[PDB]
Each structure stands twice: as structure tokens, then as C-alpha cells.
Amino acid sequence: LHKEPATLIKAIDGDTCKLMYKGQPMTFRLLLVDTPETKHPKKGVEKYGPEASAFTKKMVENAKKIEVEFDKGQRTDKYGRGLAYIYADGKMVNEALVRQGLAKVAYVYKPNNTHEQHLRKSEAQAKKEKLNIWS
Numbered sequence: 001l002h003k004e005p006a007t008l009i010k011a012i013d014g015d016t017c018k019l020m021y022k023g024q025p026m027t028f029r030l031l032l033v034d035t036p037e038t039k040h041p042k043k044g045v046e047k048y049g050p051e052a053s054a055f056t057k058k059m060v061e062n063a064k065k066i067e068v069e070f071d072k073g074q075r076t077d078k079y080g081r082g083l084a085y086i087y088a089d090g091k092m093v094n095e096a097l098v099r100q101g102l103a104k105v106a107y108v109y110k111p112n113n114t115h116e117q118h119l120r121k122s123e124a125q126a127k128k129e130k131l132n133i134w135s
């Protein structure tokens, strides 16, 4: 897995954003996680949705460097969204969300599951600490 530079364009919510990747604006979706909905009517503004968006927005807006890391399988989902592990100043946002109890490990699709165990251990910790989603 290799990390590549990207430029934040706009943070949409806890797990989806728009970035300038390789000179082109694209919307990205975080691999292996699911933060609560704050859009889509068949979900509404779920609990912790606003929280995850806020946590995430601050983290990426104050970053000096953003990097995207694709896994080994497909690089985009059915909606044309890039699928990756995104780091803000070397810190993986995917794991950060899970450790704070603001997202759950979800959508695990082989072979795009390289960091699955790392994220599951962080979620377990969040669970035992009964953090946010886990309270």
C-alpha cells in the first residue's frame, strides 16, 4: 500500500469528502467504516452523525498534509467514489473515528481489508470504554 498526496476541497460529512486527486476533483469515501448519516432521507440525521462530521472537519481543515492510501482491490465504489484510508498529518482518519466511538467497522469487502484488524482492535477499545455510539 502506498500513500499519495491529495488536497482537501470540501468535507461533506464524517466519512465522505471531496478532494483534488491527481489534478482532478473527486469524492472519496473512507474504507472499512461507517459514520452516522446526516443526509439521506431513508436514514435522516442519525445520532452522532453531527458529532462525527465535526470531529472529522476540524481534523482535516487544520491539516498541513492530506494523503490517500488505496487498498489492494477496487479503487472506487459503485457511485464513482474513491475508496481509501485517508491520513491527516500522518494520522489515519478511519482509525481516529473508530477509536472515538464515532464510526463502526463496516463494509468489509475483500480484498479491500488490509487494515481491518487494526480498525477492529480500536473499535473494541472504544466499545469497552462505552464511547459515544457504544454508550
Ligand SMILES: Cc1cn([C@H]2C[C@H](OP(=O)(O)O)[C@@H](COP(=O)(O)O)O2)c(=O)[nH]c1=O
Pocket (backbone or CB within 6 Å): 016, 029, 030, 031, 032, 033, 034, 035, 077, 078, 083, 106, 107, 109, 112
Ligand atoms: C465504504 C464502502 C461503501 N460502499 C457502498 C455500500 C453502500 O451501498 P448502498 O448505498 O447501496 O447502501 C454505500 C455506503 O456508503 P454511505 O455510508 O456513504 O452511505 O456505499 C461500497 O460499495 N464499498 C465500500 O467499501
Ligand SMILES: [Ca+2]
Pocket (backbone or CB within 6 Å): 015, 034, 035, 036, 037
Ligand atoms: Ca455513513
